[PDB]
């Protein structure tokens, strides 16, 4: 139904080595399509999805250039931010950027965004209205004014509500196969005798996509959130995702518990039982 | 602003030519543009902090651009060819200005690469006193210069009055004209006018010099011809006020 | 790539003039108009972020992304203006600007009191070329070159004095030949029948 394109940029300074380590990765929904690693022998924007490899030299020159430009801007930003925050040149630091666009069911522009971060914390972000910003601190407001004086917000404002959406809709259209697919969760339950009077019921959900899933544990039809565990949706390393949901129940009462699996891949909320 | 050197380069082919540019301090975007005669600007390469971002404009071979430092860029041309003859602009800018598409150019480097320097000739300058019928009919007075026989056309004509360069009432041609047109090897001639009041011309206290700056050879280039080495030089002519 | 009319095109002072460029490549998001004198660096005039009209003084920048057609209108052509106009553009990928090959422009100054005349400036004994001056004539006449080689004539050239707000179109012709005369120096030039002649 809903979709997005997001770019993740990570730049880390390396006191003593040549340049900083720069890593940029492009995402559409939950599947990476481009990467750039300054430490790679390539020094080029590289493809990570088969549906971006369709784009030609013009594209890759532009992305390599833009991303190198991003790298430069970040290399310079590392120095800048280091100065903004007055930090040792012997210390390793991290700038992270994320920006992208969300589309509705009709692919009409929903929302856009541009988040920027230093050493793992929010630095500056483009507001909902795509006209304001975010003064996380003075360093940020410096950048903010530096930006809205440069009319940066309008640049993104056009790119987000326009360019990135257009490209998203382009990737969605060129990546229908893998972007618009829904791999149903491979649900199944496991019974581990945690002890004598208890047994762990683990509700597995394997090889689903997108990662967006809802595992629930009901007991006697009524939802249950106590004694229930749930691991972060992990990648299988092949595009699909894993995610189990355990629960500790008194022996014999296992049938009393049901696992409610919800996913865009399956039209009807699955209910699991047994063990 | 943007400093480019040389202002003019007249050099024989086969010799390395080094175009040098100093971007405006602070500017992290350095653009190199070439402007062949009667064409628009072609971006050769642009840097962002010493690194070549978009070198998609570089002619490949012979052309070697680089920014050893932030306040100096070198566009070198090994076996320089006559085809390189053009006005190389260095441009400089910032992101904020670039967002509005503002670039700041240099005066450019009129590069003329010649096949043989034996075709280099300085200008023959000559001033012409006004026609006295004019001073009565129009109660004014206009002088004229006429630099001739020079190649290449790297000339800067300038009217000096009383040792001071004047501009008002001045009018030089846009470009010179070939004396042997059909010949791509021909020499050129320029032209200019200087109009003043009738009472100004007839005052013999006033001195009218017609200075034509020329650019040619230099200490480097080795000369052999019996002619005087057509080095970069200044050739002038003069006329004096008179109530005749 | 972009196409642009190079044609020098002459216009009378006070006239409206239309400069425009067409380009074979979308993606170009930014469209601007540069102005350039002789060989001097180019200076920006107009800059439109995208399709639409842009009214600045006597200038109007218009961009038709649909038609891939940029245009610049100048009203009441003023004295200056005469220059080469270059359209530039780019977008997204790079700052690599793409220019039209340029449009030379000549706006001819008005003449409050045109007194067409022809003078033979006393050739300095040193020089041997006879110089004939053609000045005070109105910006309605066009001066032309000549066939044979040993005939040298300079294109028209407006003379402006300031202070004394006078302006005179002047032209220069010369030659060593014994055939060159002020009587037939400007043959290929449709000079005013009213023009003066010395004798």
């Amino acid at each position: 139904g809903s979709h997005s394109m997001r770019y993740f940029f990570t730049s880390v300074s390396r006191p003593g080595r040549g340049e900083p380590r720069f890593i940029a990765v492009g995402y559409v929904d939950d599947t990476q399509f481009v990467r750039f690693d300054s430490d790679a022998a390539s020094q080029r924007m590289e493809p990570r999805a088969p549906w971006i490899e369709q784009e030609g030299p013009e594209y890759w020159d532009g992305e390599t250039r833009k991303v190198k430009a991003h790298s430069q801007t970040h290399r310079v930003d590392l120095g800048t931010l280091r100065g903004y925050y007055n930090q040792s040149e012997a210390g390793s630091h991290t700038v992270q950027r994320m920006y992208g666009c969300d589309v509705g069911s009709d692919w009409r522009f929903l929302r856009g965004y541009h988040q920027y971060a230093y050493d793992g914390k929010d630095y500056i972000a483009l507001k909902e209205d795509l006209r304001s910003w975010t003064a996380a601190d003075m360093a940020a407001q410096t950048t903010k004014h530096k930006w809205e004086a440069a009319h940066v917000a309008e640049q993104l404002r056009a790119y987000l509500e326009g360019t990135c959406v257009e490209w998203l809709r382009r990737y969605l259209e060129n990546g229908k196969e893998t972007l618009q697919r829904t791999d149903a969760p491979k649900t199944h339950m496991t019974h581990h005798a945690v002890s004598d009077h208890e047994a762990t019921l683990r509700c597995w959900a394997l090889s689903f996509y997108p990662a967006e899933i809802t595992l629930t544990w009901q007991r006697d039809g009524e939802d249950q959130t106590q004694d229930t565990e749930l691991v972060e949706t992990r990648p299988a390393g092949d595009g699909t995702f894993q995610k189990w949901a355990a629960v500790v129940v008194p022996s014999g009462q296992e049938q009393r518990y049901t696992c409610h699996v919800q996913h865009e891949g399956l039209p009807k909320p699955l209910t699991l039982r047994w063990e | 602003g943007v400093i480019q050197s040389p202002r003019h380069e007249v050099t024989e082919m086969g010799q390395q030519v080094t175009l040098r540019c100093k971007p405006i301090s602070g500017h992290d975007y350095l653009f190199w543009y070439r402007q062949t005669m009667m064409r628009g600007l072609e971006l050769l390469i642009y840097f962002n902090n010493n690194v070549p971002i978009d070198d998609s404009g570089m002619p490949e071979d012979r052309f070697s651009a680089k920014m050893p430092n932030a306040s100096f860029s070198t566009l070198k041309i090994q076996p320089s060819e006559p085809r390189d003859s053009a006005v190389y602009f260095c441009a400089s800018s910032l992101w904020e200005k670039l967002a509005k598409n503002i670039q700041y150019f240099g005066a450019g480097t009129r590069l003329s690469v010649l096949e043989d320097l034996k075709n280099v000739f300085p200008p023959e300058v000559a001033v012409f006193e006004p026609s006295e019928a004019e001073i009565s009919h129009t109660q004014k007075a206009t002088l004229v210069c006429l630099a001739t026989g020079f190649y290449p056309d790297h000339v800067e004509l300038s009217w000096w009055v009383n040792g001071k360069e004047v501009h008002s009432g001045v009018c030089t041609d846009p470009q010179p004209l070939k004396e042997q047109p059909a010949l791509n090897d021909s020499r050129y001639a320029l032209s200019s006018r200087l109009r003043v009041s009738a009472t100004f011309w007839q005052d013999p206290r006033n001195h009218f010099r017609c200075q034509v700056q020329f650019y040619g050879l230099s200490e480097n280039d080795e000369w052999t011809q019996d002619r005087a080495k057509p080095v970069t030089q200044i050739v002038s002519a003069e006329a004096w006020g008179r109530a005749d | 790539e972009v196409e642009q009319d190079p044609g020098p095109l002459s216009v009378p002072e006070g006239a409206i003039v239309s400069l425009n460029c067409t380009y074979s490549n979308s993606a170009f998001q930014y469209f601007m108009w540069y102005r350039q004198y002789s060989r001097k660096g180019p200076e920006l005039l107009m800059y439109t972020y995208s399709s639409g009209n842009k009214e600045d003084g006597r200038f109007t920048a218009q961009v038709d992304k649909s038609s891939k057609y940029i245009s610049l209108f100048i009203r009441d052509s003023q004295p200056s203006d005469s220059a080469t106009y270059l359209c530039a553009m780019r977008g997204d990928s790079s700052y690599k600007l793409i220019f039209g090959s340029g449009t030379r422009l000549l706006v001819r100054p008005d003449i409050q009191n045109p007194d067409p005349a022809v003078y033979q400036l006393r050739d300095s004994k040193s020089s041997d070329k006879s110089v004939c001056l053609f000045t005070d004539f109105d910006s309605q006449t066009n001066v032309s070159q000549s066939k044979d080689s040993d005939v040298y004539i300079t294109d028209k050239c407006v003379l402006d004095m300031r202070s004394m707000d006078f302006k005179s179109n002047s032209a220069v012709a010369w030659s060593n030949k014994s055939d060159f005369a002020c009587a037939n120096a400007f043959n290929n030039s449709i000079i005013p029948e009213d023009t003066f002649f010395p004798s």
Binding site: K66, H70, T73, D77, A139, W167 | - | D92
Partner: peptide, 10 residues
Amino acid sequence: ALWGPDPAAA
């Protein structure tokens, strides 16, 4: 595709 021609440095 990537924002362009670039930041917009901090």
